[PDB]
PDB file of C-alpha atoms and ligand atoms in Angstrom:
ATOM      1  CA  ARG A   3    -155.766  26.404 140.239  1.00  0.00           C
ATOM      2  CA  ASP A   4    -154.023  28.001 142.370  1.00  0.00           C
ATOM      3  CA  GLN A   5    -153.007  26.183 145.702  1.00  0.00           C
ATOM      4  CA  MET A   6    -155.537  26.134 148.943  1.00  0.00           C
ATOM      5  CA  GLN A   7    -153.987  28.302 151.961  1.00  0.00           C
ATOM      6  CA  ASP A   8    -154.536  27.685 156.359  1.00  0.00           C
ATOM      7  CA  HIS A   9    -157.906  29.313 155.971  1.00  0.00           C
ATOM      8  CA  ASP A  10    -159.407  27.375 152.650  1.00  0.00           C
ATOM      9  CA  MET A  11    -158.096  24.679 154.910  1.00  0.00           C
ATOM     10  CA  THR A  12    -159.441  25.640 158.251  1.00  0.00           C
ATOM     11  CA  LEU A  13    -162.911  25.646 156.858  1.00  0.00           C
ATOM     12  CA  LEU A  14    -162.721  22.577 154.601  1.00  0.00           C
ATOM     13  CA  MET A  15    -161.328  19.593 156.502  1.00  0.00           C
ATOM     14  CA  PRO A  16    -163.269  18.026 159.212  1.00  0.00           C
ATOM     15  CA  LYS A  17    -164.209  19.241 162.993  1.00  0.00           C
ATOM     16  CA  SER A  18    -162.904  17.100 166.278  1.00  0.00           C
ATOM     17  CA  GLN A  19    -165.821  15.039 167.148  1.00  0.00           C
ATOM     18  CA  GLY A  20    -166.074  12.451 170.634  1.00  0.00           C
ATOM     19  CA  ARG A  21    -162.587  10.388 170.228  1.00  0.00           C
ATOM     20  CA  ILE A  22    -161.314  11.647 167.358  1.00  0.00           C
ATOM     21  CA  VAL A  23    -159.406  15.213 167.151  1.00  0.00           C
ATOM     22  CA  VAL A  24    -158.765  17.105 164.292  1.00  0.00           C
ATOM     23  CA  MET A  25    -156.066  19.116 164.599  1.00  0.00           C
ATOM     24  CA  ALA A  26    -155.380  22.634 162.905  1.00  0.00           C
ATOM     25  CA  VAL A  27    -152.867  23.144 160.737  1.00  0.00           C
ATOM     26  CA  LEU A  28    -149.122  22.957 161.464  1.00  0.00           C
ATOM     27  CA  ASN A  29    -147.010  25.446 159.329  1.00  0.00           C
ATOM     28  CA  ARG A  30    -143.483  22.680 159.633  1.00  0.00           C
ATOM     29  CA  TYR A  31    -141.587  25.802 158.345  1.00  0.00           C
ATOM     30  CA  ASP A  32    -142.365  27.448 161.036  1.00  0.00           C
ATOM     31  CA  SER A  33    -140.832  26.052 163.887  1.00  0.00           C
ATOM     32  CA  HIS A  34    -143.008  28.828 166.463  1.00  0.00           C
ATOM     33  CA  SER A  35    -146.433  26.173 164.925  1.00  0.00           C
ATOM     34  CA  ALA A  36    -145.078  23.511 166.030  1.00  0.00           C
ATOM     35  CA  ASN A  37    -144.281  25.321 169.485  1.00  0.00           C
ATOM     36  CA  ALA A  38    -147.761  26.396 169.911  1.00  0.00           C
ATOM     37  CA  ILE A  39    -149.680  23.557 169.428  1.00  0.00           C
ATOM     38  CA  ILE A  40    -147.332  21.038 171.815  1.00  0.00           C
ATOM     39  CA  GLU A  41    -149.381  21.491 174.911  1.00  0.00           C
ATOM     40  CA  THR A  42    -152.077  21.224 172.790  1.00  0.00           C
ATOM     41  CA  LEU A  43    -151.410  18.485 170.985  1.00  0.00           C
ATOM     42  CA  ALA A  44    -149.754  16.875 174.283  1.00  0.00           C
ATOM     43  CA  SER A  45    -152.721  16.955 175.896  1.00  0.00           C
ATOM     44  CA  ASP A  46    -154.385  14.902 173.421  1.00  0.00           C
ATOM     45  CA  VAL A  47    -152.237  12.421 172.922  1.00  0.00           C
ATOM     46  CA  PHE A  48    -152.153  11.416 177.024  1.00  0.00           C
ATOM     47  CA  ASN A  49    -156.044  11.465 177.301  1.00  0.00           C
ATOM     48  CA  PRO A  50    -157.478   8.591 177.717  1.00  0.00           C
ATOM     49  CA  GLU A  51    -161.408   9.726 175.907  1.00  0.00           C
ATOM     50  CA  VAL A  52    -158.533  10.640 172.429  1.00  0.00           C
ATOM     51  CA  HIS A  53    -158.620   7.690 169.971  1.00  0.00           C
ATOM     52  CA  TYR A  54    -157.212   9.654 167.101  1.00  0.00           C
ATOM     53  CA  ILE A  55    -155.295  13.062 165.946  1.00  0.00           C
ATOM     54  CA  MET A  56    -155.508  14.566 162.617  1.00  0.00           C
ATOM     55  CA  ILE A  57    -152.608  17.132 161.465  1.00  0.00           C
ATOM     56  CA  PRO A  58    -152.712  18.940 158.288  1.00  0.00           C
ATOM     57  CA  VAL A  59    -149.282  20.197 157.828  1.00  0.00           C
ATOM     58  CA  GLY A  60    -148.484  22.691 155.285  1.00  0.00           C
ATOM     59  CA  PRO A  61    -148.159  24.712 153.587  1.00  0.00           C
ATOM     60  CA  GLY A  62    -148.017  24.327 149.373  1.00  0.00           C
ATOM     61  CA  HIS A  63    -148.032  20.951 149.480  1.00  0.00           C
ATOM     62  CA  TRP A  64    -150.261  20.342 152.083  1.00  0.00           C
ATOM     63  CA  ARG A  65    -150.260  16.310 154.013  1.00  0.00           C
ATOM     64  CA  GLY A  66    -151.776  14.816 156.105  1.00  0.00           C
ATOM     65  CA  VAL A  67    -151.230  13.602 159.730  1.00  0.00           C
ATOM     66  CA  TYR A  68    -152.825  10.969 161.095  1.00  0.00           C
ATOM     67  CA  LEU A  69    -152.699   8.881 164.609  1.00  0.00           C
ATOM     68  CA  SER A  70    -154.147   6.056 166.568  1.00  0.00           C
ATOM     69  CA  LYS A  71    -153.978   5.310 169.917  1.00  0.00           C
ATOM     70  CA  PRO A  72    -152.599   1.269 170.598  1.00  0.00           C
ATOM     71  CA  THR A  79    -148.549   0.132 173.925  1.00  0.00           C
ATOM     72  CA  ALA A  80    -147.636   1.788 170.249  1.00  0.00           C
ATOM     73  CA  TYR A  81    -148.674   4.208 168.243  1.00  0.00           C
ATOM     74  CA  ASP A  82    -149.797   4.477 164.718  1.00  0.00           C
ATOM     75  CA  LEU A  83    -148.636   7.757 162.738  1.00  0.00           C
ATOM     76  CA  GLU A  84    -149.709   7.616 159.292  1.00  0.00           C
ATOM     77  CA  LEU A  85    -148.170   9.782 157.080  1.00  0.00           C
ATOM     78  CA  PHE A  86    -150.426  11.120 153.497  1.00  0.00           C
ATOM     79  CA  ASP A  87    -149.041  13.140 151.083  1.00  0.00           C
ATOM     80  CA  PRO A  88    -151.452  13.483 147.594  1.00  0.00           C
ATOM     81  CA  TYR A  89    -148.925  12.441 145.203  1.00  0.00           C
ATOM     82  CA  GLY A  90    -147.287   8.951 146.327  1.00  0.00           C
ATOM     83  CA  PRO A  91    -145.725   7.609 149.629  1.00  0.00           C
ATOM     84  CA  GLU A  92    -142.578   8.130 148.660  1.00  0.00           C
ATOM     85  CA  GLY A  93    -142.844  12.081 149.472  1.00  0.00           C
ATOM     86  CA  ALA A  94    -143.934  11.287 153.392  1.00  0.00           C
ATOM     87  CA  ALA A  95    -140.623  11.187 154.296  1.00  0.00           C
ATOM     88  CA  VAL A  96    -140.408  14.395 154.452  1.00  0.00           C
ATOM     89  CA  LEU A  97    -142.722  14.730 157.561  1.00  0.00           C
ATOM     90  CA  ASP A  98    -140.539  11.422 159.209  1.00  0.00           C
ATOM     91  CA  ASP A  99    -138.664  13.306 161.804  1.00  0.00           C
ATOM     92  CA  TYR A 100    -140.866  16.460 161.928  1.00  0.00           C
ATOM     93  CA  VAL A 101    -143.774  13.981 162.900  1.00  0.00           C
ATOM     94  CA  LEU A 102    -141.305  11.806 165.841  1.00  0.00           C
ATOM     95  CA  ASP A 103    -139.044  15.180 166.936  1.00  0.00           C
ATOM     96  CA  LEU A 104    -143.075  16.833 167.518  1.00  0.00           C
ATOM     97  CA  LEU A 105    -143.869  13.254 169.063  1.00  0.00           C
ATOM     98  CA  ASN A 106    -140.890  13.684 171.159  1.00  0.00           C
ATOM     99  CA  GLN A 107    -141.724  17.675 172.399  1.00  0.00           C
ATOM    100  CA  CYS A 108    -145.032  15.855 173.649  1.00  0.00           C
ATOM    101  CA  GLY A 109    -143.467  13.444 175.414  1.00  0.00           C
ATOM    102  CA  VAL A 110    -143.726   9.647 173.531  1.00  0.00           C
ATOM    103  CA  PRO A 111    -140.225   8.858 172.872  1.00  0.00           C
ATOM    104  CA  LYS A 112    -139.007   7.358 169.331  1.00  0.00           C
ATOM    105  CA  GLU A 113    -139.481   3.117 170.132  1.00  0.00           C
ATOM    106  CA  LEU A 114    -143.258   4.225 171.106  1.00  0.00           C
ATOM    107  CA  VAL A 115    -144.352   5.401 167.587  1.00  0.00           C
ATOM    108  CA  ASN A 116    -145.134   2.888 164.605  1.00  0.00           C
ATOM    109  CA  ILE A 117    -144.567   4.908 161.110  1.00  0.00           C
ATOM    110  CA  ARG A 118    -146.406   4.380 157.769  1.00  0.00           C
ATOM    111  CA  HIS A 119    -145.981   5.841 154.880  1.00  0.00           C
ATOM    112  CA  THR A 120    -148.960   6.846 152.048  1.00  0.00           C
ATOM    113  CA  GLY A 121    -150.269   8.217 148.771  1.00  0.00           C
ATOM    114  CA  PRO A 122    -153.650   8.108 147.238  1.00  0.00           C
ATOM    115  CA  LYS A 123    -155.180   5.929 144.584  1.00  0.00           C
ATOM    116  CA  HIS A 124    -155.290   8.106 141.573  1.00  0.00           C
ATOM    117  CA  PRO A 125    -152.395  11.046 142.998  1.00  0.00           C
ATOM    118  CA  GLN A 126    -152.437  13.597 140.295  1.00  0.00           C
ATOM    119  CA  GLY A 127    -149.591  14.706 140.917  1.00  0.00           C
ATOM    120  CA  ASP A 128    -149.115  18.195 140.336  1.00  0.00           C
ATOM    121  CA  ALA A 129    -149.130  20.769 143.159  1.00  0.00           C
ATOM    122  CA  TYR A 130    -152.244  22.605 143.647  1.00  0.00           C
ATOM    123  CA  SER A 131    -154.455  20.454 144.081  1.00  0.00           C
ATOM    124  CA  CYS A 132    -152.352  18.389 147.550  1.00  0.00           C
ATOM    125  CA  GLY A 133    -155.449  20.547 149.940  1.00  0.00           C
ATOM    126  CA  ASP A 134    -157.993  18.801 148.457  1.00  0.00           C
ATOM    127  CA  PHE A 135    -156.651  15.236 147.977  1.00  0.00           C
ATOM    128  CA  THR A 136    -155.856  16.301 151.938  1.00  0.00           C
ATOM    129  CA  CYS A 137    -158.566  17.721 152.587  1.00  0.00           C
ATOM    130  CA  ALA A 138    -160.302  14.422 150.941  1.00  0.00           C
ATOM    131  CA  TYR A 139    -158.380  12.226 152.478  1.00  0.00           C
ATOM    132  CA  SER A 140    -158.802  13.270 156.281  1.00  0.00           C
ATOM    133  CA  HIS A 141    -162.440  12.834 155.443  1.00  0.00           C
ATOM    134  CA  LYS A 142    -162.264   9.355 154.322  1.00  0.00           C
ATOM    135  CA  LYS A 143    -160.098   7.738 157.678  1.00  0.00           C
ATOM    136  CA  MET A 144    -163.397  10.332 159.651  1.00  0.00           C
ATOM    137  CA  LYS A 145    -165.274   7.867 158.565  1.00  0.00           C
ATOM    138  CA  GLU A 146    -162.225   5.162 158.501  1.00  0.00           C
ATOM    139  CA  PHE A 147    -161.924   5.691 161.915  1.00  0.00           C
ATOM    140  CA  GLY A 148    -165.671   5.635 163.033  1.00  0.00           C
ATOM    141  CA  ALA A 149    -166.989   8.768 162.432  1.00  0.00           C
ATOM    142  CA  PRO A 150    -170.445   9.437 162.828  1.00  0.00           C
ATOM    143  CA  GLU A 151    -172.605   9.821 158.932  1.00  0.00           C
ATOM    144  CA  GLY A 152    -172.827  13.409 159.373  1.00  0.00           C
ATOM    145  CA  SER A 153    -169.424  14.408 160.679  1.00  0.00           C
ATOM    146  CA  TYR A 154    -167.947  13.311 157.704  1.00  0.00           C
ATOM    147  CA  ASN A 155    -168.311  14.829 153.716  1.00  0.00           C
ATOM    148  CA  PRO A 156    -168.614  11.774 151.710  1.00  0.00           C
ATOM    149  CA  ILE A 157    -169.345  13.595 148.401  1.00  0.00           C
ATOM    150  CA  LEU A 158    -165.166  14.366 149.406  1.00  0.00           C
ATOM    151  CA  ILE A 159    -164.461  11.067 150.473  1.00  0.00           C
ATOM    152  CA  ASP A 160    -166.366   9.189 147.352  1.00  0.00           C
ATOM    153  CA  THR A 161    -164.487  11.364 144.694  1.00  0.00           C
ATOM    154  CA  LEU A 162    -161.338  10.905 145.468  1.00  0.00           C
ATOM    155  CA  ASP A 163    -161.852   7.122 146.215  1.00  0.00           C
ATOM    156  CA  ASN A 164    -163.870   7.190 142.754  1.00  0.00           C
ATOM    157  CA  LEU A 165    -161.763   9.754 141.189  1.00  0.00           C
ATOM    158  CA  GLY A 166    -158.638  11.713 142.824  1.00  0.00           C
ATOM    159  CA  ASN A 167    -158.744  14.816 140.678  1.00  0.00           C
ATOM    160  CA  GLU A 168    -159.415  14.125 136.844  1.00  0.00           C
ATOM    161  CA  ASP A 169    -160.985  16.817 135.254  1.00  0.00           C
ATOM    162  CA  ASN A 170    -160.372  19.161 138.652  1.00  0.00           C
ATOM    163  CA  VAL A 171    -163.291  16.573 139.970  1.00  0.00           C
ATOM    164  CA  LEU A 172    -161.999  17.075 143.166  1.00  0.00           C
ATOM    165  CA  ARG A 173    -161.569  20.526 142.883  1.00  0.00           C
ATOM    166  CA  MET A 174    -165.035  21.609 141.343  1.00  0.00           C
ATOM    167  CA  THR A 175    -166.307  19.061 144.728  1.00  0.00           C
ATOM    168  CA  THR A 176    -163.588  21.118 147.048  1.00  0.00           C
ATOM    169  CA  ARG A 177    -165.101  24.716 146.034  1.00  0.00           C
ATOM    170  CA  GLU A 178    -169.242  24.057 145.888  1.00  0.00           C
ATOM    171  CA  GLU A 179    -168.376  22.327 149.316  1.00  0.00           C
ATOM    172  CA  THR A 180    -167.028  26.064 150.647  1.00  0.00           C
ATOM    173  CA  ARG A 181    -170.052  27.847 149.721  1.00  0.00           C
ATOM    174  CA  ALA A 182    -172.431  25.337 151.214  1.00  0.00           C
ATOM    175  CA  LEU A 183    -169.506  26.217 154.095  1.00  0.00           C
ATOM    176  CA  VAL A 184    -169.955  30.024 153.591  1.00  0.00           C
TER     177      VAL A 184
HETATM  178 CL1   CL B 201    -157.414   7.379 148.350  1.00  0.00          CL
HETATM  179 CL1   CL B 202    -149.183  23.927 140.355  1.00  0.00          CL
END
């Protein structure tokens, strides 16, 4: 029941493939973290070959950011506890996008949460990793590029009986 840390997310998050980019972990408290990625994120925002950009945003209470290109960009802000808590990312992400050169009028925000939230701090990483895999599939990634075990656990069970944490451990060991 410890929380996922950066390296845990890095290991288990889906990886960029083709028109889907998955960025490295962002730390919303460290101004340097946002500053350091503007150029990479701007490059992807304005690259015709990229259509989707995912960002895991922490630390601590991990959340997911999913940008879909069209004029306006769809920006889904996912909070494992439920959609209301995703409000904490609105300004953060809008400012990140404005730094990249996207005005706020071109951004369609929506807040989301999971079907089966647990509402405990320790599993936010697990939810965000598994939800990111679910998005990977939704965005049309090929069968090998996402982890069906995590998607199907999340979708049907959430982290009831800590089963999502068990799949994240097991899938991790497989990767190691
Ligand atoms: Cl879900
Ligand atoms: Cl906790």
